[model samples]
Target: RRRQLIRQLLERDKTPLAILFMAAVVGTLVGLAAVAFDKGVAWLQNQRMGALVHTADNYPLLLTVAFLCSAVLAMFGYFLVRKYAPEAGGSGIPEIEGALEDQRPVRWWRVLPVKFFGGLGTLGGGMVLGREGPTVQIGGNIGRMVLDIFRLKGDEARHTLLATGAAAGLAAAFNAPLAGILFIIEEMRPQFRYTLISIKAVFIGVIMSTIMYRIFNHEVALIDVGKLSDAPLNTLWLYLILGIIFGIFGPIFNKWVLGMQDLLHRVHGGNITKWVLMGGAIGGLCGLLGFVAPATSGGGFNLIPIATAGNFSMGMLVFIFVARVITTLLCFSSGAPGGIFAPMLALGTVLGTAFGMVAVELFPQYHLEAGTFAIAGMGALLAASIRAPLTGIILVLEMTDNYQLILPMIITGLGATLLAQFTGGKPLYSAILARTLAKQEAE
Candidate 1:
């Protein structure tokens, strides 16, 4: 009986080497693609903004040039997605999730180019979106692209490689390798198979990707809010209040996002010209705003630290927060190829700053820092909106490099998640995936 069992086990594990080999390839390619993607976006941004700096003295010409360039760039992005691959629309996370579930096909040929270029256009146009979503999608597509190129037809390898690529892409984006792997395990817990996870492979992939990211973009916190005092237990409740505020806003925000999409769909009526033109309008407005109130425009990642650095009064922070909410919704919901992740963080900062101002006023003896609230709220919106509390916390911690705020971060994240859950806010990516699946089925 023992001999028979050993033989059966040997038969079951016939090709462990093949899976590892494919996974290694996936990680390496994903890391490289991630580096390229980051460089590509940075180059586009520099070209547009760098040339216009000298002419800023002429306000009218500045506005016109900025608007026109941004509009055209945005149109280029929309055109690519609508013309080449509709699946690349919005954040590409849902598409990957659908692929992992085996409910959707991975058309890597169409997705890779469309998402990369389209994302460049939208994000480079100064839209308030992050590069991570597009990068992750591109990475997963690259993995699939590699698999298809080699004609590697195996089920488990396919899934593992896709996940690995996503992990690498994320790591490359923020130079947070551990968070990248953790993101896969926590956020995709439902879809990803734990047994297939090779931590060694993920570690190697992330290390390589981080090295590549540093090669292109030097080591810097994506958001460099200067260090602030840790939230004492006495003041922890303030973070919870901040989280509750985000929780209320988060669900409402998701609905607004979908509603905007519906409104745009009806307005354009599936006309390619109108769709691209609408994108141009949003992009142009973003560019104009970039010139007028530079803080409120672009992806908002750069502005996050500045905003939290005591630059704005409470009232000014609220005003910027409101203005950014409108701009962010319009830019993202307009069907532009961008992720709302960065914008959400920006919004959280504004709200958090407001709360911190009030808290400082109320507790003068504590010498409370408004920036601390900025840190706590940084991840709360993401947690509430996406229902990925762990990912939100880790990503923020990794990006900020602030280990002192871990307890406050967790407290805020948990509060946000619980409140959002109570209010029936579904994960934004899951909602998007369901909508895409329903549309695909209808077609």
Candidate 2:
């Protein structure tokens, strides 16, 4: 009776303001961190390009410089990842996913520095790499940094903050606020602890991060294709045909994504010498790939606008598409600090444009624009492979600024996802998540 009376008499504050405020800090930091990463890669790419552009047009000197610069640069990326933070390798998305499930550890101290500089080595070196996944990992780590700094305790606090950073990180990475929020609620719903307070905190963090991105860079759609013709009902059926191709192809693509990673494991087995050596080999080959088929390299974002504008014939699109697939598979499977998202987007553009051009030739009655098909199917690969249709949809909308193509985007994404889902397509990120756990259990 005495204890009950005392407890009733002494009330403690239970409002979410404190944690919410901390989320704001996390959001801003994550945004700035992403900007730093973007800037870092840009500078690194330019320096390497400058060296080659001047030396190049000289076949012997160009070969030596291009291959050597990327080879040495890629060596450091794999070296740092293998040496300091093994988790820093790959896109780092699955690592964050595993951390959320409490099945994996987050070595924030090691991962933060390693991923930033390591990614610079891989992506900046001209490997077919991406930064979004890396930024998301960095953002997730920043949340943990805050948790440790402020001494926030317990499961709720830990779960909420980590997710906050990841959401913010995603926001800055793609400059997509809504996509970032949906990514957590949709893709991460399996692990995220949803509550009124928790989701609100996610919103706060995402908002702040997007604001930071807006102030520093002011870019919303990280890439652009001229706004497409407002999709017409008569033309909608043609979109699904493109979707049919992606739907049929997506599982095959996703399956190889896993198979290639396994192949790389057989080649290297986590040894630094083999890791760096294979990376150098790929990096140098990638240098040659750029030299021959310039459009086949980079994260392939540059190829998006170029390919979607119908500059290439359908046969040319097929060749470039296949080449990029090979490069994306080879480069990402080698344990580099990179991602597959943009590369997939590039594939989407090539496929959509090729099909769209066919639609124009075969069905002049509809008079549909080719670029709309490119926009519509932009997220089809992502939807099918990642199995996050909503994320793929919103991300494409924000990245391309083509809201009018929503119906086609939805139609294509749905067909692709269903096809991939039923056809034994392993969801890419979770597959990676599962792979990490299998190794964890193995050791």
**Candidate 1: worst-modelled 10 consecutive residues by lDDT:** 188-197
TM-score against truth, every candidate: 0.92, 0.93
Whole-model lDDT for model 1 versus the true structure?
0.80
Can you write out model 2's per-residue Cα lDDT over 326-368, one digit (the tens) per residue? 9999998888998788888888888888888988888888877
Per-residue error at 152 for model 2, in Å?
A: 0.7
Error of 2 at 145 (Å): 0.8
**Model 2 — TM-score against the truth?**
0.93
In lDDT terms, which candidate is top? Answer: 2
lDDT for residue 424 in candidate 1, whole number 0-100: 85
- Cα lDDT of all candidates, in order? 0.80, 0.84
What clash pairs does model 2 have?
none
Q: Which portions of model 1 show Cα errors greater than 4 Å? A: 1-15, 189-200
